[PDB]
Specification:
By secondary structure, the chain is mainly β. 0% of the residues lie in helices and 59% in strands. It contains no helices and 13 strands. The chain starts with a strand and ends with a strand. It binds a molecule of 2 linked components (GLC-GAL). It is found in: Cytoplasmic vesicle; Cytoplasm, Cytosol.
């Protein structure tokens, strides 16, 4: 892996040091605290807060009740149509590895070595230059594999 970041402070907002071309991997290892309600990994067009940076891919594990993962896109401060995955591999008090693979028409995400979901591009992946991680999560490392 390339351009590795260790033990970042959350919230983390960092520049992605190269293009997200097809085959590019974003690898995030961490653990979920016992009191987690939710956390999110956001692939963003910049880091503006006013107006809020568009979020090409919002990947949002939620932990209340049975749990789920919500995915969405934010364009001009409006959320689009949510895509919900009910078969969530995340658990409070457990470590994880998220691998996001960028493909031509979509993202593919695997967690703990098992395929989890797909998310079709709504914003051109060329516009993504920023990785945001927010919420109740502890991140051990972030790494990239650029194609
Ligand atoms: O879609 C991603 C965003 O969801 C927002 O919450 C939604 C909620 O998921 C939905 O069920 C409904 O109640 O509308 C809410 C407001 O749009 C979160 O606030 C936001 O952080 C994103 O996760």
């Amino acid at each position: 892996l390339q351009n590795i970041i260790y033990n970042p402070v959350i919230p983390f907002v960092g520049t992605i040091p190269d293009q997200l071309d097809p085959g590019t991997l974003i690898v995030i290892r961490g653990h979920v605290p016992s009191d987690a309600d939710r956390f999110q990994v956001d692939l963003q067009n910049g880091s503006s807060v006013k107006p809020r940076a568009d979020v090409a891919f919002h990947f949002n594990p939620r932990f209340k009740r049975a749990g789920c993962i919500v995915c969405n896109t934010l364009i001009n401060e409006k959320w689009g149509r949510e895509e919900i995955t009910y078969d969530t591999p995340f658990k409070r008090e457990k470590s994880f590895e998220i691998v996001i693979m960028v493909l031509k028409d979509k993202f593919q995400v695997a967690v703990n070595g098992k395929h989890t979901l797909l998310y079709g591009h709504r914003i051109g992946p060329e516009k993504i230059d920023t990785l945001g991680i927010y919420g109740k999560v502890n991140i051990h490392s972030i790494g990239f594999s650029f194609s």
